[PDB]
Amino acid sequence: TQRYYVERPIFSHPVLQERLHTKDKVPDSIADKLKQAFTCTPKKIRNIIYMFLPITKWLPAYKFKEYVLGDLVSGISTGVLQLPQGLAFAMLAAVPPIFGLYSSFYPVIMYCFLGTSRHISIGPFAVISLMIGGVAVRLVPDDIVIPGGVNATNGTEARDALRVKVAMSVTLLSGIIQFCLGVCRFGFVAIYLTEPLVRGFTTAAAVHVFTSMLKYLFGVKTKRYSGIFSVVYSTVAVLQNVKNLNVCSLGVGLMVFGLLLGGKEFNERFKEKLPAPIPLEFFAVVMGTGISAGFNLKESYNVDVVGTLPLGLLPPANPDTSLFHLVYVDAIAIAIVGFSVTISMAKTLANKHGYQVDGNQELIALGLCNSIGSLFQTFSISCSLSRSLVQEGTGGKTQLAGCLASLMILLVILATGFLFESLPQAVLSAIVIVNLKGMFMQFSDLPFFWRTSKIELTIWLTTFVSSLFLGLDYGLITAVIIALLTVIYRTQSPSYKVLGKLPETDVYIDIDAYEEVKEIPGIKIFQINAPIYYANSDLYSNALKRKTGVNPAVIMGARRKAMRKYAKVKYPPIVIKSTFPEEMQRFMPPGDNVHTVILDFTQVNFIDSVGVKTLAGIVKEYGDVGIYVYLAGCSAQVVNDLTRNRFFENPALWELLFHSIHDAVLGSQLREALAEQEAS
Amino acid sequence: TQRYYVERPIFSHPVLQERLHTKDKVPDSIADKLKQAFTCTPKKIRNIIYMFLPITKWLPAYKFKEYVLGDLVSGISTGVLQLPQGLAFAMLAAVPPIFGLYSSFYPVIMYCFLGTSRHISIGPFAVISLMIGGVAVRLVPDDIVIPGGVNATNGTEARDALRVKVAMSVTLLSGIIQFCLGVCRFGFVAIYLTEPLVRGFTTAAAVHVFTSMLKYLFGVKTKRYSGIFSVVYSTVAVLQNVKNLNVCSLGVGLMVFGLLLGGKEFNERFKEKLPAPIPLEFFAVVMGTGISAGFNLKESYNVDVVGTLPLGLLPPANPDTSLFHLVYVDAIAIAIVGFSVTISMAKTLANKHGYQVDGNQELIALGLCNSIGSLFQTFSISCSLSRSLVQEGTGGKTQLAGCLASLMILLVILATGFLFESLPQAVLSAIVIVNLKGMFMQFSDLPFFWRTSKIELTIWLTTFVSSLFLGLDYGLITAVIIALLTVIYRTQSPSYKVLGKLPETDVYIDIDAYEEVKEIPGIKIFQINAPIYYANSDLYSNALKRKTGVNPAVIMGARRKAMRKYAKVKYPPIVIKSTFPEEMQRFMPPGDNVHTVILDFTQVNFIDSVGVKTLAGIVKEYGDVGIYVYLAGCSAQVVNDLTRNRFFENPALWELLFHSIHDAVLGSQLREALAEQEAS
Ligand SMILES: CC(C)CCC[C@@H](C)[C@H]1CC[C@H]2[C@@H]3CC=C4C[C@@H](O)CC[C@]4(C)[C@H]3CC[C@]12C
Ligand SMILES: CC(C)CCC[C@@H](C)[C@H]1CC[C@H]2[C@@H]3CC=C4C[C@@H](O)CC[C@]4(C)[C@H]3CC[C@]12C
Ligand SMILES: CCCCCCCCCCCCCC
Ligand SMILES: CCCCCCCCCCCCCC
Ligand SMILES: CCCCCCCCCCCCCC
Ligand SMILES: CCCCCCCCCCCCCC
Ligand SMILES: CCCCCCCCCCCC
Ligand SMILES: CCCCCCCCCCCC
Ligand SMILES: CCCCCCCCCCCC
Ligand SMILES: CCCCCCCCCCCC
Ligand SMILES: CCCCCCCCCCCC
Ligand SMILES: CCCCCCCCCCCC
Ligand SMILES: CCCCCCCCCCCC
Ligand SMILES: CCCCCCCCCCCC
Ligand SMILES: CCCCCCCCCCCC
Ligand SMILES: CCCCCCCCCCCC
Ligand SMILES: CCCCCCCCCC
Ligand SMILES: CCCCCCCCCC
Ligand SMILES: CCCCCCCCCC
Ligand SMILES: CCCCCCCCCC
Ligand SMILES: CCCCCCCCCC
Ligand SMILES: CCCCCCCCCC
Ligand SMILES: CCCCCCCCCC
Ligand SMILES: CCCCCCCCCC
Ligand SMILES: CCCCCCCCCC
Ligand SMILES: CCCCCCCCCC
Ligand SMILES: CCCCCCCCCC
Ligand SMILES: CCCCCCCCCC
Ligand SMILES: CCCCCCCCCC
Ligand SMILES: CCCCCCCCCC
Ligand SMILES: CCCCCCCCCC
Ligand SMILES: CCCCCCCCCC
Ligand SMILES: CCCCCCCCCC
Ligand SMILES: CCCCCCCCCC
Ligand SMILES: CCCCCCCCCC
Ligand SMILES: CCCCCCCCCC
Ligand SMILES: CCCCCCCC
Ligand SMILES: CCCCCCCC
Ligand SMILES: CCCCCCCC
Ligand SMILES: CCCCCCCC
Ligand SMILES: CCCCCCCC
Ligand SMILES: CCCCCCCC
Ligand SMILES: CCCCCCCC
Ligand SMILES: CCCCCCCC
Ligand SMILES: CCCCCCCC
Ligand SMILES: CCCCCCCC
Ligand SMILES: CCCCCCCC
Ligand SMILES: CCCCCCCC
Ligand SMILES: CCCCCCCC
Ligand SMILES: CCCCCCCC
Ligand SMILES: CCCCCCCC
Ligand SMILES: CCCCCCCC
Ligand SMILES: CCCCCCCC
Ligand SMILES: CCCCCCCC
Ligand SMILES: CCCCCCCC
Ligand SMILES: CCCCCCCC
Ligand SMILES: CCCCCCCC
Ligand SMILES: CCCCCCCC
Ligand SMILES: CCCCCCC
Ligand SMILES: CCCCCCC
Ligand SMILES: CCCCCCC
Ligand SMILES: CCCCCCC
Ligand SMILES: [Cl-]
Ligand SMILES: [Cl-]
């Protein structure tokens, strides 16, 4: 083993700069940069095609023998849950359920082509459907007058058609906004969604989904709520109207709930003994529809059912732009939340499988899916969190599982929709609530983040609370801003350390940590692991004066107290010799006799005008009491900040900068040695 | 001159920790901390008295011979401007002007006792008066029905009294809120008001004051505006109604404006030849009142005048709490803005004279002033920015200048108010607009901050725009949040450097800077001057792979390409030996042959779970291609972050941590030397 041997002079800033000569920057012209960016080599255009059409990349590279079984199983398990989820979220959107079935088919196919993530389940989302239903009922209220040429016994088909038109218009506008954001490179903001923020946001979204499904489980009538505290208002309304519950609907829902939970526990416990998990949502749907049809619960017990499901696909229809001015604000929120849910969950799965998802391409895919689907009577889509978990955890590898689920949905649409006409809505709510269990399991992060990092636990809890009580649109931006402000908190509460020297080395460590580190007599070394910016400068100065025990104000006060008791352009030097008489020095209270204060700037990232002013004040105040202040380890960037401000207006301050702590200590000791040599 | 000599072994983390033994933390119990905090020594209670009653400190220490002349001159110059400003801002508040005169007397006296700043002019502020007038006219509209027992020719005395009652109620509530905030240590938030933010905010406030004075200068009638874009609405309304201007009012205002500007230029240019600046506002008031009375402009030309000013002070009257529920929201905003203007300007002056102001005591003083003054028919106060500049720049030393100005205001109130009854409001507006020149001079900061720091120039401009177009309440919080986010931007755009070694030393400097620094063959040293938190980790990884030119993905791709072309708990090792055949190695494109990558962590302040995951991924990916990754200069705090996360789940990673760059380089070279020794 070799050894660490260094033999060189003390490197103050002028001494080190005497060795260093400026290098010539290589020419980097912007025009040539653009010209070389517009070369258009075939590899570049192939990469562009892959970036905009990801299916052109992962589909030719499809490992059939390794992927087909997992994709098939995941697709079946995803579709059996996608059908009832589609119907339920169509009910949430104040549109007929067949439109939810449509929204479960086209967008998934288009996202298989345009999407980067290979584990998320594209489809209707409860919160997005709630926003769509809110805007649709605002524009088309229940008490609207429609001269449709019908008798007094109106079947509300015209109202449903008008609400469908409103939903398509808002979906098209949200898709256009999302596509424009994706083109404008907005997806970079996805870097601000940290893992605790994403997980708290998704858990709050799951709680929102659970709240939105309560009225259909109980069979009660409830006002639509959307906005701040919408979850609280909805829960309060449900618990208020629970006295008018439908006992038959609640019984069927709870029965499906219990069997679904039992089956899920059976699947999880016997996972190793089962070739593929049993698709339980399909069994629940079939069993609930059979019980509802056999006992005729629709009118004998007034149990709400799905209703008629027309067969066949609809031709493309141009949405009316004339409603844009009435929905644009809403179309903005749906544009954000729909992205926020999609890019969060994708990340949650991407980090689970060691790949990365392009936020810009996610925005482009979402926008194109929404805008094109609005032509096919599709309302706004997102990522279904619980269904994404089901798809990922069932062995899903690519998005071909989404295509298989869409094919099952298309089978329902084209041929077998009429079988699900008598299916109660309580069964759908029970299915959704049961499948929210995997998302509710994310509450185990609280002990985890408690043990790992309490700041990120705070981020988790703040995101959860803000996205729960406020909306997922205002709550998300609140959480993002607070998570960013956690960095400000970190800089505002740094580790102020007083350093001591490990003997016979150049290693300087916190004096109160190891106890072989010994403080150098007459020298104080103070270290902050933070920048010295404006929100930090005063705290840094106070901590420097407190921890080191060298307060210039206290020193001046003691000198004046002894003065009271004993009685019975061309610049001046920075450090003023203490002209205190020895007879009056007999009145000094005993002290550490510190002649130099070393400020460790190795971990100081930057310093602004306020920090520079504080530093200059510190230097001047310590020089007024005859104490030298040295800066050790100032980076070239921090030196540039000190130079851009007028810190080095006096060139003498240049000799206060040293390369390292050991350089500063040696320079101070040499300064003292020369001073005592010249003294006598 | 001595030399830097170091001779020691290579300090990897285990090697250095073998020398270091844990120290015993001194016992610091919270109960004993509270017990020693409740000692109540006479010095402690004296300090408490000084902190809560600052006049008990600076008044006994009043240097009479050095301060009296400056205080007298500053007080006279402050009062001559305080009178018309008080009348004008009373007009802004929809209250009779005598109430502005009252608001110019009691709060200044109380702030002389309770205030920490010794240069700001306490009094009515245009924006606070605008908020008070807005709430007063909202609660008491111009078309209100008052059964006051009067004829059809109502003189609007009852409406004025009701508006005064509303103003007192909102003032009392705002004062209570401010006092409660000051007690609760809210003033700490004053640390978040950096100098560019403060100066931009104050310049925007000056523009607000200029906008609010236009209608009285032109003599036009304008709707009251308060809220977002209130300045734009007010300016648009004034320029719309300017066709109905009062030519006499505009002429008198512009004449006073021109003489005031000429006199101010005369005072500034001949400052050295004048013992004291001429008080020009008093001359303007006297001259305008004399012209208005002599030519009888009140009804001959329908020129708006100040109106009657009753003489004598009013007895204390209890404000009606019954209006609190109607004004509380407004009382919150006035509580914030009034503090925000006061603590900003104070800081602006404090930094100018080398002292500090306690934000908590500023809040307490403002709250007590407002709450007690509301008993004396005083509406909410703040710091007058232009008058504060006048007081500071005229030689003001203590707050006794404020007391002299208050004594002049009291002289006007008690005996000579009736002389100012015929004074036109155009003269008051002209005086205010002329005196806003010193505040408008702050626009010179734009070239200054352009040269010093463009980030803080951005802070200046953002604060100005936000506080201008939005209110001073929403604009201020917007500016504070954006100024805080500038730190996030700084961390998100750090200096990614590739380091090279200065020969015969241990100094490692950016390779592209000095050109005597030479890169060590086979070793890459990468440095970031930022933390590696979540919003930074992916950028840091990309920059590491790009700047160093060592991309593990590209290396694996090239190895597989050569494979194609040539054909025609117990853990595994971190770094996998590259089992590439020499015959296939003949297919390697030439490369740098880098065996070790050194990551400089000296300037990395902290690392969270996301950063730790990125770092572990970097280590694993580089070890998969047979490249070692070393961490150099990891602080004890960063080591604690890596340990709290499961980074050191494999103990072998402990040997990847070195004390410094030179230690890591020597360790890598020794590792290679031992490898070649054992090879053959
Ligand atoms: C200061 C940092 C730490 C947090 C900032 C949070 C901000 C962005 C949050 C806090 C609460 C939020 C408000 C809560 C409610 C509403 C009402 C709604 O109809 C429009 C949005 C609006 C007005 C929100 C705007 C954004 C908001 C002001
Ligand atoms: C960089 C940005 C995101 C930092 C945070 C700025 C936040 C705190 C600002 C920016 C825009 C602001 C909003 C702008 C306008 C209004 C309408 C007004 O009637 C109530 C306040 C409210 C709702 C503001 C609340 C605060 C607000 C949301
Ligand atoms: C043990 C001292 C640190 C404790 C940190 C706990 C963080 C809790 C954050 C709660 C945030 C709630 C937002 C409404
Ligand atoms: C080990 C973590 C020590 C700190 C625990 C408490 C963290 C509190 C973070 C508060 C951040 C507030 C940002 C607005
Ligand atoms: C020369 C490249 C840096 C230029 C920085 C200029 C900053 C201007 C900020 C403007 C903010 C306006 C907010 C509406
Ligand atoms: C010399 C300064 C280099 C950077 C100039 C441009 C600074 C732009 C700051 C933008 C901050 C945005 C925070 C929301
Ligand atoms: C950047 C998001 C908005 C893109 C512009 C959309 C404008 C709507 C299209 C015109 C409708 C009349
Ligand atoms: C509203 C549009 C915002 C666009 C923001 C683009 C930011 C791109 C930064 C790229 C950094 C690598
Ligand atoms: C990806 C396929 C897009 C096809 C869009 C066709 C739109 C036709 C609209 C006809 C309106 C009458
Ligand atoms: C987010 C940018 C605005 C989104 C597009 C709004 C289009 C409004 C059209 C209004 C027509 C009167
Ligand atoms: C992002 C491109 C979306 C294209 C979908 C159709 C846009 C136009 C709608 C019909 C206008 C008449
Ligand atoms: C913290 C600021 C609010 C302090 C509480 C004020 C409550 C008003 C007093 C009671 C009025 C009826
Ligand atoms: C609304 C009340 C907020 C109180 C915040 C007090 C913060 C004090 C921090 C003290 C750090 C030295
Ligand atoms: C600092 C002096 C405060 C005096 C407050 C007296 C309040 C008297 C109110 C009488 C109401 C009738
Ligand atoms: C900032 C905390 C609230 C300020 C005090 C509000 C008092 C409201 C009283 C309402 C009475 C009905
Ligand atoms: C902060 C203390 C202010 C005291 C001023 C009077 C508060 C009570 C107002 C009258 C209530 C009847
Ligand atoms: C309106 C903003 C359009 C996009 C500006 C450039 C963003 C960064 C591109 C790399
Ligand atoms: C705690 C939920 C809100 C109140 C629900 C009960 C209201 C009365 C129901 C009879
Ligand atoms: C007698 C039971 C009739 C059930 C008809 C609907 C069956 C649903 C299968 C999906
Ligand atoms: C993605 C394939 C879309 C096919 C739409 C067919 C519509 C037929 C309407 C009669
Ligand atoms: C995999 C099944 C795809 C859907 C088939 C639908 C048949 C419709 C027959 C009318
Ligand atoms: C609302 C239901 C919350 C249930 C939390 C379950 C956490 C289990 C961690 C193992
Ligand atoms: C709001 C309910 C929170 C429940 C947290 C339970 C965490 C259990 C982790 C094992
Ligand atoms: C070890 C237990 C940690 C518990 C942290 C979660 C606290 C939840 C408070 C709402
Ligand atoms: C991650 C960016 C989140 C932006 C939220 C914006 C909310 C707008 C609500 C209308
Ligand atoms: C709005 C109140 C913000 C308080 C921040 C406290 C930070 C303390 C750091 C020492
Ligand atoms: C409501 C907050 C009351 C004050 C909490 C303690 C603030 C820090 C005191 C030093
Ligand atoms: C640009 C200011 C707003 C328009 C002012 C002029 C309106 C017409 C005045 C006759
Ligand atoms: C003839 C002029 C009368 C002027 C009376 C008011 C004088 C104002 C002096 C402050
Ligand atoms: C600060 C001194 C306050 C004196 C108030 C006197 C009021 C008298 C009313 C008749
Ligand atoms: C310095 C002048 C103080 C105010 C004197 C007021 C005299 C009033 C006489 C009735
Ligand atoms: C609105 C008037 C702005 C005038 C700016 C003057 C700046 C002078 C710098 C010397
Ligand atoms: C909005 C007007 C801005 C004027 C800036 C002028 C700066 C001059 C500095 C010498
Ligand atoms: C040297 C000139 C610097 C000018 C910076 C101010 C720009 C103002 C843009 C609104
Ligand atoms: C420096 C703290 C500024 C806080 C602004 C709050 C605005 C509230 C408006 C009602
Ligand atoms: C709301 C858009 C925020 C964009 C921030 C851009 C920061 C760029 C740092 C590289
Ligand atoms: C190179 C083929 C890319 C995928 C085309 C679409 C296949 C369904
Ligand atoms: C290399 C295979 C290209 C075609 C993929 C399958 C298209 C349906
Ligand atoms: C190598 C190409 C495999 C394609 C598999 C397609 C499965 C539908
Ligand atoms: C490795 C894939 C083999 C099967 C190719 C697809 C056959 C249908
Ligand atoms: C989710 C698709 C199920 C289709 C079942 C059709 C036969 C009942
Ligand atoms: C790097 C591409 C930027 C594109 C900006 C938006 C172009 C319309
Ligand atoms: C209220 C219904 C009782 C019978 C069904 C019970 C299912 C748990
Ligand atoms: C082992 C799971 C039993 C499920 C019983 C019903 C749950 C609601
Ligand atoms: C799921 C089968 C239910 C059968 C009910 C039959 C009632 C006539
Ligand atoms: C009104 C409740 C909002 C909750 C936000 C929590 C942020 C700490
Ligand atoms: C942790 C720092 C938060 C500061 C927010 C701004 C308060 C005015
Ligand atoms: C020790 C005296 C403090 C000031 C008392 C008030 C003087 C007007
Ligand atoms: C030391 C002087 C105390 C009194 C100051 C003046 C009080 C009016
Ligand atoms: C040393 C005490 C001086 C007091 C001066 C008071 C001026 C009014
Ligand atoms: C140094 C102050 C001398 C004057 C004291 C006050 C005399 C009125
Ligand atoms: C600002 C106070 C002036 C008082 C003047 C009284 C004589 C005109
Ligand atoms: C350090 C004092 C804190 C006071 C908190 C508020 C007490 C009511
Ligand atoms: C129209 C004659 C004006 C006389 C007074 C002068 C004020 C400018
Ligand atoms: C030297 C200042 C002359 C002032 C003329 C009038 C300014 C509006
Ligand atoms: C400022 C003196 C004005 C005098 C005007 C006299 C008109 C009768
Ligand atoms: C609507 C104008 C707001 C201006 C805010 C500026 C912040 C960069
Ligand atoms: C979603 C954007 C949050 C603000 C980030 C600003 C960083 C400079
Ligand atoms: C019963 C009260 C509900 C509050 C919101 C819970 C999500
Ligand atoms: C739980 C459903 C069973 C149907 C018969 C209920 C009486
Ligand atoms: C004439 C338009 C005025 C816009 C606001 C200026 C302050
Ligand atoms: C000439 C403008 C001032 C009006 C004075 C009228 C006597
Ligand atoms: Cl969902
Ligand atoms: Cl002002």
Swiss-Prot record, chains A, B:
The record gives the membrane topology as: Multi-pass membrane protein
Which residues does the annotation say bind salicylate?
A: S386
Q: Which residues lie within the membrane without crossing it?
A: 230-241
In its keyword annotation, does this UniProt entry include Protease? Answer: no
Q: Where is this site: Contributes to anion binding?
A: R387
Associated disorder is: Deafness, autosomal recessive, 61: A form of non-syndromic sensorineural hearing loss. Sensorineural deafness results from damage to the neural receptors of the inner ear, the nerve pathways to the brain, or the area of the brain that receives sound information.
What's said on domains? The STAS domain mediates dimerization, with both STAS domains latched onto each other in a domain-swapped manner. The N-terminus domain is involved in dimerization such that each N-terminus domain embraces both STAS domains. The STAS domain harbors a unique anion-binding site important for the fine regulation of the high-frequency electromotile properties. The transmembrane domain consists of 14 transmembrane segments organized in a 7(+)7 inverted repeat architecture that can be divided into two main helix bundles, the ''core'' domain and the ''gate'' domain.
Report the function annotation for this chain: Voltage-sensitive motor protein that drives outer hair cell (OHC) electromotility (eM) and participates in sound amplification in the hearing organ. Converts changes in the transmembrane electric potential into mechanical displacements resulting in the coupling of its expansion to movement of a charged voltage sensor across the lipid membrane. The nature of the voltage sensor is not completely clear, and two models compete.
Its protein name is Prestin
Q: Which gene encodes it?
A: SLC26A5
